[PDB]
Amino acid sequence: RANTNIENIGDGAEVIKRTEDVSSKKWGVTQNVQFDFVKDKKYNKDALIVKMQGFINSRTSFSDVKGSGYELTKRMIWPFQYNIGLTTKDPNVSLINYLPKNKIETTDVGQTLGYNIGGNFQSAPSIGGNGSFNYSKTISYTQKSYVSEVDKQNSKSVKWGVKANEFVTPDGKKSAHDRYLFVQSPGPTGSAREYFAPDNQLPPLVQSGFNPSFITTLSHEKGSSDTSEFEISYGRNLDITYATLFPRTGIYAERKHNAFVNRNFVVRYEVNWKTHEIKVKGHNK
Numbered sequence: 001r002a003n004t005n006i007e008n009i010g011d012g013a014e015v016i017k018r019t020e021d022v023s024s025k026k027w028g029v030t031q032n033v034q035f036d037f038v039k040d041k042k043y044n045k046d047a048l049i050v051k052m053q054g055f056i057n058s059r060t061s062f063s064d065v066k067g068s069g070y071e072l073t074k075r076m077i078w079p080f081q082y083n084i085g086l087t088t089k090d091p092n093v094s095l096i097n098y099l100p101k102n103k104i105e106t107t108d109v110g111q112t113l114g115y116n117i118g119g120n121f122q123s124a125p126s127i128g129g130n131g132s133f134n135y136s137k138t139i140s141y142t143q144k145s146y147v148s149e150v151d152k153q154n155s156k157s158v159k160w161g162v163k164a165n166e167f168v169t170p171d172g173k174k175s176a177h178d179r180y181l182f183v184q185s186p187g188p189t190g191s192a193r194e195y196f197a198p199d200n201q202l203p204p205l206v207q208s209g210f211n212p213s214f215i216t217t218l219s220h221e222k223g224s225s226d227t228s229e230f231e232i233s234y235g236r237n238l239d240i241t242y243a244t245l246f247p248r249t250g251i252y253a254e255r256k257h258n259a260f261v262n263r264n265f266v267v268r269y270e271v272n273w274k275t276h277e278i279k280v281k282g283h284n285k
């Protein structure tokens with residue numbers, strides 16, 4: 001036990017802390033995942049608190065459009081939604097909590113999952129409210145201009161979507177569905193980049209990417225089989241904005257919504273409930 005990260009959380013209980021870091025340069029994703037085993041002599045089930053952090057590249061790009069008739073048409077690809085999900089198919093595991101649990105629209109998200117000896121979990125949509133738990137884990141992320149929704153939740157899977165909502169533009173607030181979002185008149189230098197809002201008008205989730213912070217707890221009956229597999233998916237859905245310069249009537253824009261869906265990096269992990277170990281089994285790199 002000397003070379004394992006173990007926290008004593010009270011009489012008869014401890015937490016075994018594991019981590020995995022799995023990246024894909026092709027998908028532009030890093031999964032930095034924490035897997036905390038709750039070991040409690042007064043709780044008849046095993047529990048693994050999984051905290052999903054890392055990075056999902058926005059994959060925003062600006063390009064020329066090839067072909068006759070498209071010489072004054074430029075393309076901006078950008079992420080309408082970030083996808084984060086954890087799924088299992090094993091009968092021996094179920095999801096017993098998830099955070100965030102409800103839709104959250106604030107720029108900052110900060111929530112806590114608390115555990116008390118005897119199998120008691122609680123969640124709160126804030127950080128620093130309680131010093132009452134035997135163990136706690138928190139999530140924290142910023143999602144300026146985007147909102148978080150639970151797109152799917154059930155005993156085997158949880159999926160969150162962090163979706164474009166409303167943006168601050170020089171002309172005022174703009175809906176994420178406004179076909180003229182990010183479009184501007186550049187030509188003088190005629191670069192594809194100049195047909196779209198400069199980097200200082202693009203919020204972090206468009207310019208750079210998203211740093212997820214989500215939790216779900218896996219539950220396993222002691223006495224069922226030693227291992228379970230589960231998949232964690234991080235990715236994005238991209239929209240396209242096309243901007244065409246008509247020298248006599250100005251800039252014209254068209255949006256292709258959900259242009260590239262589920263561009264996701266999916267990693268399959270195995271939890272060994274008996275040895276308190278996590279292994280990477282596969283991925284779609």
Ligand SMILES: Cc1ccc(OS(=O)(=O)O)cc1
Pocket residue numbers: 026027028059077238260263
């Ligand atoms: C055209 C295009 C758009 C996005 C790309 O990155 S992906 O989302 O990681 O697949 C790659 C090519």
Ligand SMILES: Cc1ccc(OS(=O)(=O)O)cc1
Pocket residue numbers: 063064075240
């Ligand atoms: C540079 C580039 C990027 C995306 C492309 O696919 S499209 O948007 O469906 O035309 C084609 C070329």
Ligand SMILES: Cc1ccc(OS(=O)(=O)O)cc1
Pocket residue numbers: 082083084085086087151159160161232233234262264266
């Ligand atoms: C919103 C959302 C979240 C995760 C997704 O990937 S999956 O878990 O591999 O299906 C897809 C959509």
